[PDB]
Structures are given as C-alpha cells and as structure tokens.
Write an enzyme that holds these catalytic residues in place. Structure first.
Site, PDB file in Angstrom:
ATOM      1  CG  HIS B   5     -50.853 -36.078 123.881  1.00 60.01           C
ATOM      2  ND1 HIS B   5     -52.203 -35.782 123.753  1.00 60.01           N
ATOM      3  CD2 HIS B   5     -50.717 -37.416 123.693  1.00 60.01           C
ATOM      4  CE1 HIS B   5     -52.853 -36.868 123.432  1.00 60.01           C
ATOM      5  NE2 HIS B   5     -51.958 -37.883 123.419  1.00 60.01           N
ATOM      6  CD  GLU B  77     -52.705 -32.233 124.033  1.00 59.49           C
ATOM      7  OE1 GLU B  77     -51.683 -32.016 124.729  1.00 59.49           O
ATOM      8  OE2 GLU B  77     -53.190 -33.369 123.848  1.00 59.49           O
ATOM      9  NE  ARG B 165     -36.800 -39.177 100.064  1.00 59.97           N
ATOM     10  CZ  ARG B 165     -37.346 -37.977 100.328  1.00 59.97           C
ATOM     11  NH1 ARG B 165     -38.642 -37.833 100.559  1.00 59.97           N
ATOM     12  NH2 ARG B 165     -36.574 -36.905 100.317  1.00 59.97           N
ATOM     13  NE  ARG B 220     -37.137 -36.268  96.321  1.00 57.39           N
ATOM     14  CZ  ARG B 220     -38.396 -36.728  96.389  1.00 57.39           C
ATOM     15  NH1 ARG B 220     -39.330 -36.082  97.082  1.00 57.39           N
ATOM     16  NH2 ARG B 220     -38.708 -37.844  95.738  1.00 57.39           N
TER      17      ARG B 220
END
Ligand SMILES: [Li+]
Lengths: 232, 251
Positions: B5, B77, B165, B220
């Site tokens: 990839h 990878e 959320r 938050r």
C-alpha cells in the site's frame, strides 16, 4: 464546512441523497467521471469527495479510507449532509474455489469481524445490506451480462479461520462492509456493496493485470448503473 | 514497490529504522520539514510518506489514516521496510477537567476500544507504549518547558458512538458506549483518539517500539470554545516534541 472531517457543506451536495463510497481517494474522480459534470468538492485526510449527475440527479462520490473507523466518519458526515443511501464498490479477493477472477460479488450481509460495527449495534445484530439497494445492484449486474455471486462477505479490521469462513460459504474478505451495513441498518440509511473479484485466495495462479483492471471497471460501471436504478 | 500500500521500496528509506506516524497525510510534509533534506517519497491512498534526516540519520514520516485498520497497514509495511520504532504524534481532545487546551499528553497505554488490536493480541494484553520511547517523549516535552500529562488514553474505532458523541444524526449511542465517557473519566483516562491501541498492541507483540504524544486542542469538559491560534501553536508544539524525541532516540 458543516461537518468535522469531509470539509463539505450541505449546499455543496446540490441535494444529493445517494453516495457511492469507494475506499481509495484516488478512485473517486474516475468514478465521478462515469457520470455527468463531475466536480471536485473537497479533499481532507483520506476523504476525497466529488459531485456528479446520474441521469440528471446529483450523486456524491466520497472515499472512505481503509477500515470501519475511517468509513464510519465518512458515512455519518455524509448522512448529516442528507445522504441516506450508500453504495460501496471495491475490488476483493474471493475465498471460494469457483468464484473466479473477473467475477462480481454482491454482498448481501457481512461477518462482523470489525470493531466499529460494535459501536452501532451488539454483535447479535446482522450486518445486512438494504434489500432494495441489493436488488438494484443485482439488476445492474444482470443488465451488464454479469451473474453476480450473491452472499456473505467477511469484513475485518486487518488487511487480509479462512477455512472456517469458506466452509460457511463466505465469498470474500474486505474491510469496510460490516461497519457500513451495521451503521446504516441501525440508523435508517440504505447500503449495498458490489465488488469485482481481482484475486482468488484458493488459486495457485496469479491474477492477470488486465483482467483485474477490466473487473474493477466493470464493478464501478455496475455500481453507477445501480445508483441510476435507485434514483429513478 | 516492496509493500502493498505505501508505494515504497526499502532503498527509498535509506536505512531509516524510526518512523514518525501522524494521522493526517497533509501533516506529513510539515513534520518532515522540521528535519533536514526533507524529501517527498510517495503518496498512495491515505499514506503520504516523506524521508528526512535528524542530525544525520534518516527518519521516515508516514501518515496512518484514521483508525486501527488503516494504521495497522502502515505500521506493518513500514516494519517490512525495516522500521522498528514508531512515534505517533497527534492532536487530541482531553476528557479530564484540568487538562487544558495547550497541554500535551504522552500516552503510556490505551483502553482498547478498537478492533484491530484484537488481531495481534487477546483483549487481556495491555496496549502499552514502549518504555524507552515514552521516556524520550517525556524528556522532549520537558526540554520544551512542558510538563506532559502521562497516562491512559481511550482508543476507539469510532469518532462518534465509541466516543459518546450525541451531536450526531440519530443522537443515540449503543448501550456498550452509553455512560462510557464518564466511565473513562472516573478511571483517570486522559483523552480519546483512534489509533494508539492498535499501534501499541501490534508493536508490543511484534517486538517494535511505539510511543505517542499529542497536543490537546479541545477539552470536552469545558464550555469555552478552543482558540484557533492556541490550537495551531499546540500542534506545532506536539510536532516539535516528537521530532525532538526522535532525535533523542536516534542519538
Ligand atoms: Li483510513
């Protein structure tokens, strides 16, 4: 933007209610160009989004990245922008001996080997595709002269126990469809998934490069055809 | 390319054995550019990779995408191409009252709310950062005049439900994740993100080293909207800290 990641506002979709959601940002443009007036909308992170028109109607084409987490973000944010139908297209590897390179699979439901589906429903819930959308995909294959293998796909969180899936008749392996299907089933959106088989994991022989590109072309052509059936 | 990839060959890394792995492909250049001779290598799907030199030694900088699945591919990878150390840098949202926008978190370990970590170890295995790389991260913070919050992060396969959320479409979270944020807060969990439990479990179980640092860009628990300029300053700061930590580990 109106959403946290895709960099899109609702007006950009020009009323689109349907998205084609391939994995690869780099594939978005070419799928958009099978429709009319393909128009880049945004590109942030792995999310490249285009608008195009299929038989006069707006379709959004938006990459998901690889895996259920990145897909979940794209699907949720497109739904916030009014998309209620999501057609996945992708290239896959088959695990059934007679599902050959160049065949097409319409995934009716997926083995949920993904973590993200569990954020949307307990495991007992079936990662099932929408019936009408799957019907449209199968219709589009048939119109193209292709008889799809229709059945179950193993949908997992790492790039890719296999015998277990084969003996259960599972057709192929990918990484986004369980998440896609579960999140859409549970919140009232429609989803379906088509994929060109580019490799067969039971097979000795290496797949031909030209076969693999033709197969992917076919799958993209089918999904666009299915999108027009649904927006008819 | 030697891997499926990333579009890289081993020779392109020029011997690098340490990767800085940000989430966002569009941040890779900026990081590469704090070191010397930054060079574009490749860009395939969500993986953008550069090479650069920290005091003479090559470092690969490569995006992971969002989430454990995409991260697992980049990490596997890069290891095939010989990387054995992975330093994650990110921007994050704190869930503890006094962890202010502008602060930095060094994640020593993660709550495994992800699925990819399960491909590498059963859930009982701790998603723990390597001790020496975490040590370098903390030292790099302190050199930058910053006392990091060192603790546990919650690492999730969703941005939305698994992060509790509700300003979503359905505005509903699965039972599993209902009350879960407050659960993590009570357990002293510092912040949420989406890749570190995969990163840390796959690295720990396969003999690679991983650490993670992040700039707190949102809390938050606070009503106050984060300031634009502080967020950029925090992000610059997290990135210099991870470059500094790479330098320490390669010295
Ligand atoms: Li991704």
């Amino acid at each position: 933007a109106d959403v946290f990641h895709l960099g899109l506002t609702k007006a950009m979709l020009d009323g689109a209610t349907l998205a084609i959601v391939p994995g690869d940002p780099e594939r978005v443009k070419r799928i958009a160009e099978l429709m009319d007036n393909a128009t880049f909308l945004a590109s942030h992170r792995e999310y490249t989004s285009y608008l195009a028109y299929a038989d006069g109607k707006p379709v959004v084409i938006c990459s998901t990245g690889i895996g259920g987490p990145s897909t979940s973000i794209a699907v949720e944010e497109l739904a916030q922008l009014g998309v209620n139908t999501f057609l996945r297209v992708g290239a896959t590897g088959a695990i059934q001996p007679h599902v050959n390179v160049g065949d097409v699979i319409v995934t009716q439901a997926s083995v949920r080997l993904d973590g993200a589906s569990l954020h949307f429903a307990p495991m007992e819930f079936p990662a099932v595709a929408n019936f009408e959308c799957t019907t449209a995909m199968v219709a589009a294959c048939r119109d193209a002269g292709v008889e799809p293998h229709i059945g179950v796909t193993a949908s997992s969180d790492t790039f890719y126990s296999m015998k277990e899936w084969q003996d259960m008749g599972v057709l192929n392996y990918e990484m986004e469809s369980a998440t896609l299907f579960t999140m859409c089933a549970t919140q009232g959106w429609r989803a379906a998934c088509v994929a060109g088989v580019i490799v067969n994991r039971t097979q000795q022989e290496i797949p031909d490069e030209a076969t693999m590109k033709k197969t992917e072309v076919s799958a993209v052509s089918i999904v666009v055809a299915a999108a027009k059936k649904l927006l008819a």
